Amino acid sequence: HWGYGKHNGPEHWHKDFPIAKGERQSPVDIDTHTAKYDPSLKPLSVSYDQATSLRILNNGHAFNVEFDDSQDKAVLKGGPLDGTYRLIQFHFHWGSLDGQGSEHTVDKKKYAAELHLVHWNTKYGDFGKAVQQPDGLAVLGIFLKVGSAKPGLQKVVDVLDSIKTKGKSADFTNFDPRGLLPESLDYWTYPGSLTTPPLLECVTWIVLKEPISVSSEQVLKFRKLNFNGEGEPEELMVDNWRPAQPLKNRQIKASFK
Ligand SMILES: [Zn+2]
């Protein structure tokens, strides 16, 4: 099945998921000089005060921190978005080395990692229906660079030993995703896709300009996870990123001058 190896990685996905070569695939390179300021975008509204985290799961390609999405508790609105989008999970993509790991790039620069906060449009009732719509999802993407530790990440890092291998989960209640956000909500936005199979073209991407800093020790713990299940040959979960895809007939808009 699909993965991030030589024989099953991004360059192979199109065989099972032909939409991999589609018109609105993600990630993309953000060419900061060609993005255009769009004065009519609104400020984003990230309303995470009532968020209810439930669980953390190693799904074999990343780890997901899952939320209760059965009410409007942690929602994204505004910006480019019409309506209300509920947080369902967040996860990261990261590298084997500090010089790669992000999915989006900025003027071809790769960050050490990228956080994706995944939200679905409440007008479609559930996640599974939302991913079949062109405006079904809103993903907030946040770059990670290595430097100072991110205090609000530490609780995530410290549970990773309990979910080392594929299929393991752990209770993960009372985690506050506000502690993963940078100071500024300045962003770029464009229409795109899921970055993992099935690669559905259902996402309004909102990529923050300001990275967060995490420590070497924090990213090193990400790199101790495994792609494999327990009792299978160990393969470190690193380099779980899809590279930049062609922009095609899209324009990236900026919320800021
Ligand atoms: Zn992702």
CA 86/CA 246 separation, integer angstroms: 29
**Header resolution in angstroms:** 1.2
Provide CB contacts within 8 A for 50, sequence distance 6+: 73, 74
Structural domain total, the chain: 1
Inter-residue contact 162 to 182 (CB < 8 Å): no
Please identify every residue whose CB atom is under 5 Å from ligand 1, which is an ion: 116
Q: Which of 8, 45, 27 is nearest to 111 (CA)?
A: 27
Q: Which domain holds residue 240?
A: 1-257
235 Cα to the center of ligand 1, angstroms: 20
CA 71/CA 63 separation, integer angstroms: 23
Q: Are strands 203-208 and 187-192 parallel, antiparallel or unpaired?
A: antiparallel
Candidates 1, 33, 61, 104; catalytic one: 61
33 is catalytic: no
> Is residue 7 part of an annotated ligand binding site?
no
The per-residue DSSP string of 17-37 comes to -GGGGSSS-S--EE-TTTSEE
91 Cα to the center of ligand 1, angstroms: 6
Technique used to solve these coordinates: X-ray
56 Cα to the center of ligand 1, angstroms: 15
